[PDB]
Amino acid sequence: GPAVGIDLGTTYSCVGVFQHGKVEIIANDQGNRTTPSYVAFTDTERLIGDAAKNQVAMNPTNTVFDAARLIGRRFDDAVVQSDMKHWPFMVVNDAGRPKVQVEYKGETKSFYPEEVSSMVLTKMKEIAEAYLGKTVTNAVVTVPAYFNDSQRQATKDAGTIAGLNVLRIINEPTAAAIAYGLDKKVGAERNVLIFDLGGGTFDVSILTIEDGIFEVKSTAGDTHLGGEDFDNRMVNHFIAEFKRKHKKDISENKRAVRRLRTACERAKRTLSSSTQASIEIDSLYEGIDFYTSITRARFEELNADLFRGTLDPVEKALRDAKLDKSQIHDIVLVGGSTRIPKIQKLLQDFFNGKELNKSINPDEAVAYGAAVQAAILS
Ligand SMILES: Nc1ncnc2c1ncn2[C@@H]1O[C@H](COP(=O)(O)OP(=O)(O)OP(=O)(O)O)[C@@H](O)[C@H]1O
Ligand SMILES: [Cl-]
Ligand SMILES: [Cl-]
Ligand SMILES: [K+]
Ligand SMILES: [K+]
Ligand SMILES: [K+]
Ligand SMILES: [Mg+2]
């Protein structure tokens, strides 16, 4: 092709390409190495990635995300029925299959989850093409290890619709392991633990690798735990702060809340590198500017329980895998949330000081591995 590797995440997608023995994680038109898994529909256009997320606050009903949560599932699924209650966009039943319903150019339209995902994949494909200066056709697309045959099929279909020849659908933890060369043959089998904390889901996977062959020993986690939840904690904290400082509640102003959330998400990323972050919002509510800051210590306290809770699925995974902590040869960090220092501390302490594989940006590790595998399969 060269063939590319694409990580189609619930919240962000990432694309990489293996060239000259090196993986290049490709930045998009805005210079971002990951792109929001968002698609928006308006009176005049269809927006994807950054363009879509940048307007979610003003067009909540027609801005779609979380397609990964619906992909390959049935409308009558308990989780689909539960998820629908929290999404601002509509989900309808088409002969037992879920479809997102939106308004586009003044008309009601509906798209299958794979159609929405194909739009995101198209964006990733174009991002790669802009970088390579060549047409990209072949690709390896990743999925969570617990995905079933239908969810994998629908994911492959999204690729095909986007014009990609999906060489293979591989598990996210396996892709992460490959990124670190943990698939190389060293004689005996090795047990690897993948700790994946993304924007919306937490996945712990224990893999056993031997002769380049992977075996998913066990999986654990929480499909509703991620960076988004950490943002929510900060949002509530600041809503309370604004109320104290202005005797005004912004909670019911959907937009004001979203703008605060975006500011919180950005502050959070900064706290992974510095011990303090500033938040300065203009015209947050009724023309009132909100200039404040938050410390890393404060951020950690607001999320203490959630952070500490990530260890439970780790213990469960080990138990189900019938392995003690000491039997894990490597710990791989995946997902943007694992960049949080407190999370790294908790996991390392749990593993009695064992070092964490974290040299590859956690939110890029999956695409990195997928790119390596795509090259191999080309
Ligand atoms: N430096 C950072 N510190 C803390 N959190 C970060 C940092 N960079 C990114 N994040 C968070 O990482 C999350 C996105 O992670 P990732 O890119 O792995 O998502 P994803 O694969 O779509 O995840 P999932 O499928 O779980 O939603 C967001 O919540 C984002 O705020
Ligand atoms: Cl772009
Ligand atoms: Cl601690
Ligand atoms: K991702
Ligand atoms: K995840
Ligand atoms: K997941
Ligand atoms: Mg992910």
Q: Where are the domains of the chain?
A: 1-64+120-184+358-378, 65-119, 185-225+310-357, 226-309
Confirm or reject: Cβ of 265 under 6 Å from ligand 1.
Answer: yes
Judge contact between 278 and 293, C-beta under 8 A: yes
CA angle 276/279/285 to nearest 5° reads 155
Spatial CA neighbour of 197 closest among 169, 166, 230: 230
Query: What number does the ligand 1 atom closest to the CA of 227 have?
Result: 29
Q: Are strands 165-171 and 138-143 parallel, antiparallel or unpaired?
A: parallel
Separation CA 107–CA 290 (nearest Å)? 38
Residue with CA closest to ligand 1 atom 5? 337
Q: What are the residue ranges of helices labelled H in the chain?
A: 50-53, 78-84, 113-132, 149-161, 172-179, 227-246, 254-271, 296-308, 311-320, 341-350, 365-377
* Count of CB atoms situated within 10 Å of the CB of 59: 18
Give the tokens for residue 220: 């654990």
Pick the CATH number of 226-309 from 3.30.9.10, 3.90.640.10, 3.90.1150.10, 3.20.20.370: 3.90.640.10
State the number of CA atoms in the 13 A half-sphere of 211 facing the CB.
0
On the question of a common fold for 185-225+310-357 and 226-309, the answer reads no
46 in ligand 1 pocket by Cβ < 6 Å?
A: no
Instruction: Say if ligand 1 is within 6 A of residue 363 CB.
Output: yes
- What is residue 357's DSSP assignment? B
2 prior amide bond cis, ω within 30? yes
Q: Which residues of 278-297 are buried (b: 16+ CB within 10 A; e: fewer)?
A: ebebeebbeeeebeeebebe
Q: How far apart are CA 232 and CA 104, in angstroms?
A: 30
185-225+310-357 homologous superfamily: ATPase, nucleotide binding domain (3.30.420.40)
Q: Which CATH architecture has domain 65-119?
A: 2-Layer Sandwich (3.30)
Q: How far apart are the C-alpha atoms of 180 and 368, rounded to whole Å?
A: 9
Per the CB < 8 A criterion, the answer to whether 45 and 59 are in contact is no
Nearest to 216 by CA among 185, 200, 194, 187: 194
Question: How much distance in Å is there from the Cα of 196 to the middle of ligand 7?
Answer: 7
Q: What whole-number distance in Å separates Cα of residue 78 and Cα of residue 162?
A: 29
Q: State if residue 117 touches ligand 1 by the CB under 6 angstroms criterion.
A: no
Evaluate: CB of 272 within 6 angstroms of ligand 1.
yes
Q: Which residues on neighbouring strands pair with residue 169, listed in sequence order?
A: 141
68 Cα nearest atom in ligand 1: 25
Q: How far is CA 2 from CA 110, 170, 192, 368, 375, in A?
A: 34, 18, 29, 14, 7
Instruction: Report the separation in Å between the CA atom of 10 and the middle of ligand 7, taken as the mean of its atom positions.
Output: 7
Atom of ligand 1 nearest to the CA of 272: 3
CB 239 within 8 A of CB 263: no
Distances in whole angstroms, Cα of residue 34 to Cα of each of 8, 9, 280, 302: 10, 10, 25, 27
**Does ligand 1 come within 6 angstroms of the Cβ of 200?**
yes
Way it was determined: X-ray
Q: Which ligand is nearest to the CA of 363?
A: 1
Distance from the alpha carbon of residue 125 to the mean position of ligand 5, in angstroms: 22
Closest atom of ligand 1 relative to the 7 alpha carbon = 21
Ligand 1: residue whose CA is nearest its atom 18: 335
Spatial contact of 267 and 277, defined as CB atoms under 8 Å apart: yes
- Spell out a b/e string for 111-133, using b for 16 or more CB atoms within 10 Å of the CB, else e: bbbbbbbbbbbbbbbbbbeebbe
Domain 1-64+120-184+358-378 has CATH 3.40.50.970: no
C-alpha triplet 271, 272, 276: angle, nearest 5°: 20
Is the CB of residue 13 less than 8 Å from the CB of residue 198?
no
Whether residue 198 has its Cβ less than 6 Å from ligand 1: yes
How far apart CA 174 and CA 182 sit, in angstroms, is: 9
CA of 198 to the centre of ligand 7 (A): 5
Residue burial 237-259, b: 16+ Cβ < 10 Å; e: rest: ebbeebeeeeeeebeeeeebbeb
